[PDB]
Symmetry: C2
């Protein structure tokens, strides 16, 4: 139930232990007035300081003037902070506004088309994003709803995604969660304690070429549908061969324990783990932080199921792009389809109580 | 505690403690063969016994023959029972199959059209339901996914709804949950401790007319969207006047504490509490067991959120129908819309290890 500190050199919600629930929103900007947009970023930062400490925004949820709408919508009253983090990102499309064209980072690369992509344009892209993670879904919905309300007239929600359960780990000391295919997901990630690996693979550095982004990161979001009818009729051996790990323990093929190191030559040449491993990709390493979803039925008698994949990296060109390119022959492709995509530059942290989201850019 | 017993005179999931999360699924039957359907009910009961104890279905999720699909899909390995309950119900449309038309209970009444209804036919009705409630949403989803798999070829999933209430790890058990309008929700309800009130208002009795249903109950489900962005622009006074209770404490107007008994004459005539109260409805009293939902955002950027309303009662004609009829002029109607509906007869409990869901109906 405890609070996660909001201020720092980096934004929380990346290296932080992964919380149980997600509410992710992408917004488009509707104002052309730079000063008005700056005012919004400041007001949002002030609200985020309240929300992440379990307090109501503005003057509260009740006890004001009877004839005015309350400043806070009130549905998180009496709840703990529940490890809420709020992480903001800026999309490539933002940099066509407010005279920002020459400040777009090179590392904020547009993704190529990948074989098998079927991207819905309405649930792709976005001028900006807010990732809300918490252990209580009500706390996460409250945060997104109140930010959107404050932004009325300056921003609109483009698309959103809820995640009911995590499929990732930044804490190797704790149990690794399973995805809806029934396999542990998150064994070989980057841990929040691994400061050297975070500096090498996740945080942007001054020397990388974009000063305002120092201490930030780059985010790729992919909405992935899972063909569960097809998967659920596969044999146990087929399932294990797809990944290169056994289902019950999650050990590499031939080994006894989850955290034993993979021996790649024992895996099939199209096994997911073999293709995705840093040693297969010139050392490229990612911080994975995704969640499972189910959005009803598919209208054909079946449950809908998928994975909302999130990865953080120091440079999109040296992280997600080489790895996903190497997955062109993945055995897993038979059972999944990418149906949504977005990239964002995640700025540095809010240093103290006088700072504000995006201050290094604006 | 960690598990809820499966066996009993009544099914669990009605009077037993309210769990943090819901996965509710409605199913349509595709077979015409009565024997095949009975065999499914037996297989589903065997699976439910395993699932509610935190065990995998059948021979397990791994360690069987490599060339066979696993019996259990594996996504709940390592999780706890999580207070899982599985509650089955039968829709009016099931009774047009298997020669059952003369065994439909009179208390399983079709609902009338109510003012302002905008029902999506695709998210309404169903031959069967399974209500899966647990404190961990992955435990609930795993249960529905595996029942649907076991049934493939005999049933399909018609519609599915996820919901949430409180998070019990961080929120005290005695605190009333708030709904997404920011008001406390559940103050004046039937509690599972009230044995006599359950007998009077919730459980079907033998003398009610349908012997196979003795110890069962009747369920109404309504998916109710809230117009969140319109509500959030209303004044504090307007929101309180809609309900007849204050927002901070949830006390009735003119009183000081949440649990103070209401004085109906102090509320506005079309306030929700005044219209819904038993004294306004000839004594009609309901067990509410609903869950909030937030599904995402719609094509206009608005939040697709609301209340998945569930009510249990001894007879639909003397429970939900009179009360919802009385809400025709409710001040709350400005901010909500009913967009899905279904009714089910929930049979009696599974008595012991040799009994099965539906045994009193099928024989
Ligand atoms: C529905 C889609 C996916 C599923 C079900 C899935 C599943 C898994 C599983 C079960 C593991 C093994 C345990 C672990 O180390 O985490 C794994 C590893 C991994 N996955 Fe995926 N994955 C999916 C999509 C992706 C995508 C899109 C990428 C990147 C483009 C990716 C990158 C990785 C990486 C880098 C590893 C760790 C390899 C290593 O260093 O040992 N995965 N995945
Ligand atoms: C989105 C829809 C609804 C919302 C937000 C809502 C909200 C509330 C609230 C805040 C209360 C007061 C606290 C309490 O005693 O629980 C209440 C009471 C009540 N509601 Fe509703 N309600 C909704 C729909 C319905 C429907 C559809 C019915 C029945 C057909 C219903 C029946 C009642 C009853 C019987 C009470 C208790 C009144 C009493 O005995 O004091 N509600 N509701």
């Amino acid at each position: 139930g405890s609070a996660v500190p909001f201020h720092g050199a980096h934004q929380a919600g990346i290296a932080t232990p992964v919380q149980d629930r997600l509410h992710f929103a992408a917004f488009d900007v509707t104002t052309e007035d730079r000063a008005a947009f700056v005012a919004l970023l400041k007001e949002w930062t002030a609200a985020a300081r309240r929300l992440t400490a379990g307090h109501a925004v503005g003057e509260g949820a009740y006890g004001g003037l009877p004839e005015a709408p309350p400043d806070d919508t009130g549905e998180a009253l009496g709840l703990k902070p529940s490890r809420l983090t709020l992480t903001i990102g800026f999309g490539p499309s933002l940099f066509t506004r407010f005279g920002l064209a020459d400040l777009r980072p090179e590392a904020l690369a547009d993704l190529p088309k990948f074989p098998g992509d079927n991207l819905d344009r309405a649930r792709s892209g976005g001028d900006l994003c807010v990732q809300a993670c918490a252990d209580d879904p009500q706390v996460a919905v409250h945060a997104i709803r109140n930010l959107a309300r404050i932004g009325f007239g300056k921003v609109v929600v483009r698309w959103s995604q809820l995640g009911f359960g995590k499929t990732s780990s930044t804490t190797p000391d704790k149990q690794t969660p399973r995805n809806l295919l029934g396999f542990k997901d998150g064994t070989r990630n980057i841990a929040g304690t691994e400061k050297d690996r975070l500096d090498r693979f996740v945080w942007a550095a001054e020397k990388d070429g974009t000063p305002w982004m120092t201490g930030g990161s780059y985010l790729v979001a992919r909405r992935i549908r899972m063909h569960i009818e097809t998967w659920d009729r596969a044999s146990l051996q087929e399932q294990e061969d797809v990944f290169g790990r056994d289902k019950g323990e999650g050990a590499p093929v031939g080994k006894a324990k989850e955290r034993d190191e993979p021996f790649l030559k024992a895996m099939k040449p199209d096994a997911h783990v073999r293709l995705a491993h840093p040693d297969s990709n010139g050392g490229a390493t990612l911080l994975r932080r995704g969640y499972s979803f189910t959005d009803g039925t598919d209208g054909l008698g079946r449950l809908d199921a998928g994975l909302f994949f999130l990865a953080y990296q120091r440079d999109i060109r040296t992280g997600f792009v080489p790895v996903q390119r190497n997955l062109a022959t993945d055995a897993l492709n038979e059972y999944i389809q990418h149906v949504g995509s977005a990239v964002f530059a995640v700025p540095p942290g809010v240093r103290d109580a006088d700072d504000w989201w995006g201050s290094t850019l604006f």
